[PDB]
Amino acid sequence: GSPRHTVPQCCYGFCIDLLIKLARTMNFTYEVHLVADGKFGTQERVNNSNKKEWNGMMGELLSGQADMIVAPLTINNERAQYIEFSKPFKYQGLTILVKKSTLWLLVGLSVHVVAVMLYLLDRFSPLTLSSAMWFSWGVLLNFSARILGMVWAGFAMIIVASYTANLAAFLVLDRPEERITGINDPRLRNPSDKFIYATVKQSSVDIYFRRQVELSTMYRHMEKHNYESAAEAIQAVRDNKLHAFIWDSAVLEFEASQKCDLVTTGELFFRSGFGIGMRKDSPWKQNVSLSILKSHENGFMEDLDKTWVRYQETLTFENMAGVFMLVAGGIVAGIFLIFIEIAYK
Amino acid sequence: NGMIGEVVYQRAVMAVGSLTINEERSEVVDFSVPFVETGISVMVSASVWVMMFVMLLIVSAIAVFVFEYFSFTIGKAIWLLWGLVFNNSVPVQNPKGTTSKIMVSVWAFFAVIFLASYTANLAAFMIQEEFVDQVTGLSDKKFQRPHDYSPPFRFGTVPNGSTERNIRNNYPYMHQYMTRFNQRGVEDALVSLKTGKLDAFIYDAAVLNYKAGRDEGCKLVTIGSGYIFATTGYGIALQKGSPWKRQIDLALLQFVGDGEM
Amino acid sequence: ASVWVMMFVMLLIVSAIAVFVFEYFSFTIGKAIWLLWGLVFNNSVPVQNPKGTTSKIMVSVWAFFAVIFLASYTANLAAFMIQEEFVDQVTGLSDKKFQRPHDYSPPFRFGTVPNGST
Amino acid sequence: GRDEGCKLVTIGSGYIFATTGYGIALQKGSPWKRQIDLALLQFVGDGEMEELETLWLTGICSSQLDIDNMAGVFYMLAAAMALSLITFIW
Ligand SMILES: *[C@@H]1O[C@H](CO)[C@@H](O[C@@H]2O[C@H](CO)[C@@H](O)[C@H](O)[C@H]2NC(C)=O)[C@H](O)[C@H]1NC(C)=O
Ligand SMILES: *[C@@H]1O[C@H](CO)[C@@H](O[C@@H]2O[C@H](CO)[C@@H](O)[C@H](O)[C@H]2NC(C)=O)[C@H](O)[C@H]1NC(C)=O
Ligand SMILES: *[C@@H]1O[C@H](CO)[C@@H](O[C@@H]2O[C@H](CO)[C@@H](O)[C@H](O)[C@H]2NC(C)=O)[C@H](O)[C@H]1NC(C)=O
Ligand SMILES: *[C@@H]1O[C@H](CO)[C@@H](O[C@@H]2O[C@H](CO)[C@@H](O)[C@H](O)[C@H]2NC(C)=O)[C@H](O)[C@H]1NC(C)=O
Ligand SMILES: *[C@@H]1O[C@H](CO)[C@@H](O)[C@H](O)[C@H]1NC(C)=O
Ligand SMILES: *[C@@H]1O[C@H](CO)[C@@H](O)[C@H](O)[C@H]1NC(C)=O
């Protein structure tokens, strides 16, 4: 797009005010800036001489062009193999973002045949036709021909009882599978081209799954859909191009508070901690980690919750509305049929 | 004293056992990075009828038009508009109207499907299982004064524990409240909560989750997931200057990142 | 298979009372079955305005049976709705289909993998 | 267990079938026949075989129909037609 010009703009938020609290604590000045790309950092073989290199924030920190990575660093083993770390502050797991008759016509065709044949057997047994029809209208819907009509009225309750039972069954038990229920979904172990699950391109979630030696299917499946930023993923799942996304819990909870259709999943896995990316043995380790634990002990964590974390932003109208629309539309035709009797009488 | 002095006076090497971590413990030794999220906690025990009512006047005007077509059904028409919703079948009036016996075959079916939808509403309410909380956390108004509310309640912590020092660094007056609210035994406090000799109790949340998963009846219920609480972790304490710390931390990061944890 | 028999016997026991109740105090002597089984289902049918007080007590205790009968039948429908059957036409290797596909009307087909021990 | 939709349905659990097992074929006169069979029963008698079967299996897995009820209605209305014919011939 445009990597040409680096512009000074304004930054604020969680870690900004965290570092402001650190500057209130520790005696230092700052140099706040951003990273040139959209990657956390991955160790990959470079094109020449077959040598491993880092990228993202990690390659720029190891180049000496930076001093401190104040960021939600996914702390794992391979990052710790090279540099020293602080103790984490953001403790959270992982979640998955999702987005949230004919037989009656047969009864209606049979009931008028019954209503005709009961009167046509009444004419043999010692406005009577319309009287019989208007008596039969209240049978299905609330002397031998009376013995037949009591049997038909006995069926009239059992038909609508079965209809009530299976309409309740259509909405209570068979809930549609809008959820995934986490990693143990068999439809993601051997997926298809419909369940689009993915994550951030070249992220440490992919490295954590690369350590997982039993999920080679999902590793080579997300490569068609690894995206740069999560803001890409929000619009992609908004446009129904995605179907599942792998990210932290509280960020997606805040975005569920933003957009109501953004729905997480039930399971809570990989309960990990996030800290500040640091250099090697440095004078900004002892005092700084003591300040971290001082931030843990006081109510400044609850203040940070009050900044962004704590803040947020049957009714019977589903299937009977379409029936009531036809009911309201039939009123005009029912009134118009009275004018035929006006012209008749 | 305790496990601290064995490491400070170096009679021991490291504390592999579980240990809460605060500032003054980190002053004397160097803790490892934690592996489990173990916080602290407290154990305790409109327009639907309107669209019918609008069309009710329309159907009443239709009944007036039935009276204009071809002799006192006015409030009886209100009874009929009730019965086309409820079907109570009270013997009052035999409908002799030609038009009035036509729209009843739509309205009574609407009453049938409305009754079916109300049974569906009650089944959906049966699906919904509610759980309410009187106390939300440390920001409770009950934590101002137990005399401010009508029951004077009671709650304490473990004696000679780090939670005591944490609350004394949080609220020194709450130490004065707990001074008359002390206890000795953890299972003794459990029996006091079961029988009613204790109202609330502040303790580490994961041990309370382990006891609640084996709780006989699941009567005592936790509150939340550590939202208004300390929400700390459990690491391993080592001596300052021990070369094992980096290797132990790499072993921790291997033991977490494999699912064996 | 024994529910309708005792319900028939109960129907006779109920219908025998309203004969003598109306006899003590003009068309529903033997016609009480047409009212009774017609108001089992509560079909909103104009049948007869009851005048016997003991007959009204009997209708009041019979309508609670009519409520609990449809309640128990909706319960039976829900219990059958829980039962999701998994039935198979072929029982095993001794199937009648495994003699000749001309015996049944659709010509079906079944085979194995080539060069198999099966 | 990995079927998309679980449309194809198995028949029983091997009751009218072969119901055999899978061994390991070795040459005649091999000394490993005792030791491999000891290792098999060690791998089964600790849940480790069950752990591998838990790893490599998945024991997972809707419409209205009342054709028996409609057939009963259609038979009882024919019986009612016969009862009406009893009154018709009288
Ligand atoms: C990022 O945004 C700023 C917005 O001011 C770009 O700076 C200039 O923006 C104006 C108005 O859109 C353009 O006409 C200029 O071409 C931009 N400057 C130049 C020389 O690029 C900024 O440059 C943008 N980043 C890039 C590299 O495109
Ligand atoms: C926090 O850092 C300061 C240094 O920045 C440490 O305090 C120093 O301690 C040494 C003796 O060990 C002496 O140079 C001075 O007494 C202190 N120097 C300054 C400039 O503060 C301190 O040890 C660190 N943390 C704490 C509070 O223990
Ligand atoms: C909790 O701490 C107090 C500290 O006073 C213990 O009381 C005694 O204190 C004296 C003086 O410090 C010690 O010499 C004794 O060892 C303490 N009592 C004992 C164990 O004999 C108190 O006993 C401690 N125990 C609890 C859980 O109440
Ligand atoms: C069983 O396997 C063999 C070998 O694949 C097949 O037999 C021959 O296969 C060659 C492969 O080039 C063909 O050219 C011959 O025509 C095959 N001869 C036979 C026996 O048909 C055989 O097709 C396989 N199928 C069976 C019998 O199950
Ligand atoms: C920080 O250090 C500088 C060194 O000159 C000193 O002037 C300043 O007062 C210090 N600020 C504090 C009080 O932390
Ligand atoms: C080759 O160089 C480009 C630019 O640094 C880099 O993005 C790419 O990953 C390299 N190729 C490989 C496969 O290492």
CA distance C9 to B168: 80
Length of chain D equals 90
* Backbone torsions φ then ψ of C52, nearest 5 degrees: -75, 130
Q: Are A93 and A274 in contact (CB under 8 A)?
A: no
Q: Which two structure tokens, joined as six digits, stand for A226?
A: 């690894």
CA distance A23 to B36: 29
Radius of gyration of chain D (CA): 30
CA distance A19 to B120: 54
Distances (CA, A) of D13 to B151, D19, D53: 63, 9, 17
| Contact criterion met (CB < 8 Å) for B87 and C49 | no
Of B101, B113, B254, nearest to A323 by CB-CB distance is B113
CA distance B218 to B194: 11
Q: Are A93 and A268 in contact (CB under 8 A)?
A: yes
CA distance B143 to A92: 28
Q: Give residues with Cβ within 8 angstroms of A333, minimum separation 6.
A: none
Kindly state whether D84 is in contact with chain A, defined as any CB-CB distance less than 8 angstroms: yes
Q: Which atom of ligand 6 is nearest to the CA of A44?
A: 14
CA distance B204 to A43: 40
Of C38, C44, C74, nearest to A165 by CB-CB distance is C74
Q: Which two structure tokens, joined as six digits, stand for B173?
A: 């007056």
Longest dimension (CA), chain D: 96
Query: What sign results for the dihedral spanned by CA atoms A79, A84, A90, A92?
Result: positive
CA distance D62 to C84: 9
* Backbone torsions φ then ψ of B30, nearest 5 degrees: -120, 105
What's the number of CA atoms in the CB half-sphere (13 Å) around residue A309? 16
Which contiguous run of DSSP H or E holds residue A73? Answer: strand A69-74
* Backbone torsions φ then ψ of A284, nearest 5 degrees: -100, 40
Helix (H, G, I), strand (E, B) or coil at C63: helix
Strands B40-43 vs B37-38: parallel, antiparallel or unpaired: unpaired
Classify the phi-psi angles of A182: left when phi > 0, otherwise alpha if psi is within -120 to 50, otherwise beta.
left
Suggest the residue from A73, A83, A87 to mutate for an interface test with chain B (most B CBs closer than 10 A).
Answer: A87
Suggest the residue from D9, D10, D11 to mutate for an interface test with chain C (most C CBs closer than 10 A).
Answer: D11
Report how far ligand 5's centroid is from the alpha carbon of B72 (Å): 97
Kindly state whether D15 is in contact with chain C, defined as any CB-CB distance less than 8 angstroms: yes
Measuring from atom 7 of ligand 6, which residue has the nearest CA?
Answer: A46
Which residue of chain D comes nearest to C86, CA vs CA? D9
Q: Are D76 and D19 in contact (CB under 8 A)?
A: no
Q: Which two structure tokens, joined as six digits, stand for B168?
A: 């004394």
Q: Are C52 and C23 in contact (CB under 8 A)?
A: no
Residue A218 CB neighbour total at 10 angstroms: 18
Beta bridge partners of A55: none
Measuring from atom 17 of ligand 1, which residue has the nearest CA?
Answer: A5
Query: Is A261 close to ligand 6, i.e. is its CB under 6 Å away?
Result: no
CA of C37 vs chain B CAs: smallest distance (Å): 17
| Contact criterion met (CB < 8 Å) for D9 and C92 | no
Q: Which of A37, A43, A44, A47 to mutate to test the pocket of ligand 6 (most atoms within 8 A of CB)?
A: A47
Measuring from atom 4 of ligand 4, which residue has the nearest CA?
Answer: C115
| Contact criterion met (CB < 8 Å) for B254 and A77 | yes
Report how far ligand 5's centroid is from the alpha carbon of A25 (Å): 12
| Contact criterion met (CB < 8 Å) for A168 and B127 | no
Strands A269-277 vs B232-233: parallel, antiparallel or unpaired: unpaired
Report how far ligand 6's centroid is from the alpha carbon of A42 (Å): 12
CA distance B43 to A323: 51
| Contact criterion met (CB < 8 Å) for C86 and D9 | yes
Q: Are A197 and A245 in contact (CB under 8 A)?
A: yes
Residue A122 marked ligand-binding: no
Q: How many helices (H) and strands (E) does chain B have?
A: 10, 8
A60 CB burial (10 A radius; 0-12, 13-18, 19+): middle
Helix (H, G, I), strand (E, B) or coil at B34: coil
* DSSP-assigned letter for residue A227: B
Residue C90 CB neighbour total at 10 angstroms: 15
End-to-end CA distance of chain B: 31
Which contiguous run of DSSP H or E holds residue A91? Answer: strand A90-96
Residue A279 marked ligand-binding: no
Residue B122 CB neighbour total at 10 angstroms: 12
CA distance C49 to B18: 82
By what method was this entry solved?
cryo-EM
Q: Which two structure tokens, joined as six digits, stand for C48?
A: 């007869």
Q: Which atom of ligand 4 is nearest to the CA of C114?
A: 28
* Backbone torsions φ then ψ of A234, nearest 5 degrees: -65, -45
Residue B104 CB neighbour total at 10 angstroms: 21
**Tokens 């409109």 sit on residue:** B46
Closest-approaching ligand to the CA atom of A287: 2
Suggest the residue from A90, A158, A296 to mutate for an interface test with chain B (most B CBs closer than 10 A).
Answer: A296
Q: Are A93 and A183 in contact (CB under 8 A)?
A: no
